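Just curious: can you write whichever protein you like plus the matching structure tokens?

***
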Amino acid sequence: TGSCSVSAVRGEEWADRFNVTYSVSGSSSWVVTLGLNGGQSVQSSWNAALTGSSGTVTARPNGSGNSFGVTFYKNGSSATPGATCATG
């Protein structure tokens, strides 16, 4: 009981790559697990730290931030990525 709060939006994007702007409510304890779509890799991020760059990444605290954006190469991808925050 205490899942983190998150939100996925079609943040800025491009033709060769797309981006997203996730928003958090009170996830003071960052521990989400983003799941790419086989191929989509992370290129850069800001407003937060991430662990990994392909497969299963997790957000991390670095002072204070609930909204972080990240890039995602597609070159033939599809469904956008998303951040997980559930308990169990």
